[PDB]
Design a protein around this ligand. Structure first.
Ligand SMILES: CS[C@@H]1CCCC[C@H]1OC(=O)N1CCC[C@H](C(N)=O)C1
Ligand SMILES: [Zn+2]
Length: 140
């Protein structure tokens, strides 16, 4: 589990969104596994606006932050799960790192700010949903 709190927005994995997130919905995209809801309090995270392909992510199943090299956002095939059928997920970046269930929502960050959140795992790989192109998270 986990979320990004920027401005008056809460960014979560669409597959882990709560009823309150759906009742206060700003934007959602199943092809990216992302959902954004509105918040009453202001958040403290800042979004990275950069081209970093190295950073650090939080792994809840290890209580640890790991440094990783990750691929550029791309269209990647993700196996059928209990949340989605087999499909291509867009704006997904892969790295070598542990990831198991408990773990979407952990933040990936660089020196510029938050890059994205854990969205896929298994096989000694970890995948992250990029948020750096969502410029509107910085306004309103
Ligand atoms: C993420 S850990 C898990 C490890 C065992 C193998 C499967 C791994 O699950 C995933 O990759 N998922 C499940 C939740 C939805 C994700 C998505 N964004 O489509 C895909
Ligand atoms: Zn950066």
């Amino acid at each position: 589990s986990g979320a990004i709190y920027v401005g008056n927005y809460r960014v979560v994995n669409r597959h882990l969104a709560t009823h309150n997130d759906w009742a206060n919905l700003v934007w959602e995209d199943s092809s990216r596994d992302l959902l954004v809801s509105s918040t009453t309090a202001q958040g403290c995270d800042t979004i990275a606006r950069c081209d970093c392909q190295t950073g650090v992510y939080y792994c809840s199943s290890r209580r640890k932050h790991y440094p990783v090299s990750f691929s550029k956002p791309s269209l990647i095939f993700v196996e059928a799960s209990e949340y989605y059928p087999a499909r291509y997920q867009s704006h997904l970046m892969l790295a070598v790192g542990h990831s198991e269930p408990g773990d979407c929502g952990g933040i990936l960050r660089c020196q510029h700010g938050v890059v994205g959140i854990v969205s896929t795992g298994g096989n000694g790989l970890v995948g992250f949903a990029d948020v750096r192109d969502l410029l509107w998270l910085d306004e309103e």
